[PDB]
């Protein structure tokens, strides 16, 4: 798995992440990971982990660096011999993160950084939870998620830059614009 790309997806809440994600696998054919969706499944799963991470997700909160790369690592591996890239999104979230992920998988090669204003973000995650209903919607919980996006997982943006492989992406625009973008970042791998 360390011999695939390895790119990461970095951004707010309803910065629209998993949508320019889902994009990418259709037109590259990239694995799309998501920690949310891998952390959601273990809640639908039953277990008593489930009811544990179900708690700390609809509080907004973080759910614990092992936990979270475990389910990553475990999926990278499912899915191994399949795929020539991988789309790490909604992970890291913190810089403890970004360097665990690289002492136990390999370092990644593009940060695609979704950068979106906090209004849009909130505007976005009001709407989906009229929608779709995810407990984690609710107003209260929206401005925890995104009080500590901004803490927490935009260091992990300076840190990449560090690095320097954060491309950022102006998320504002209409989706088909972003995507372009989006495009442009990856073909000039
Ligand atoms: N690494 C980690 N470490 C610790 N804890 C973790 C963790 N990962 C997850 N967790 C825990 O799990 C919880 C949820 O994590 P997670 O599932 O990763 O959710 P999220 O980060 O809050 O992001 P969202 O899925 O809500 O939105 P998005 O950024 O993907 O945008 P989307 O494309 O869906 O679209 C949003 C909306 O806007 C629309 N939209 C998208 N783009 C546009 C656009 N250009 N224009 C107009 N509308 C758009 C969309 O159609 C959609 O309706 C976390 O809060 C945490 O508790």
């Known amino acids: 798995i360390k011999d695939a790309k390895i790119i990461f997806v970095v951004g707010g809440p309803?910065?629209?992440?998993?949508?320019?994600?889902?994009?990418?696998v259709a037109k590259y054919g990239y694995t799309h990971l998501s920690s949310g969706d891998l952390l959601?499944?273990?809640?639908?799963?039953?277990?008593?982990?489930?009811?544990?991470?179900?708690?700390?997700?609809?509080k907004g909160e973080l759910v614990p660096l092992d936990t979270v790369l475990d389910m990553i690592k475990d999926a990278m591996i499912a899915k191994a011999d399949?795929?020539?890239?991988?789309?790490?999104?909604?992970?890291?979230?913190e810089v403890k993160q970004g360097e665990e992920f690289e002492k136990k998988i390999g370092k990644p090669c593009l940060l695609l950084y979704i950068d979106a204003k906090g209004e849009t973000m909130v505007k976005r995650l009001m709407k989906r939870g009229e929608t779709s209903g995810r407990a984690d919607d609710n107003e209260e919980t929206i401005k925890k998620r995104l009080d500590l996006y901004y803490k927490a997982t935009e260091p992990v943006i300076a840190f990449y830059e560090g690095r320097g492989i954060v491309r950022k992406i102006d998320s504002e625009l209409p989706v088909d614009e972003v995507f372009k973008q989006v495009s442009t970042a990856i073909d000039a791998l």
């Open 40 to 58: 959601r499944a273990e809640v639908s799963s039953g277990s008593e982990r489930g009811k544990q991470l179900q708690a700390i997700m609809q």
């Open 14 to 24: 309803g910065s629209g992440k998993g949508t320019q994600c889902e994009k990418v």
């Open 82 to 93: 399949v795929s020539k890239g991988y789309l790490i999104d909604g992970y890291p979230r």
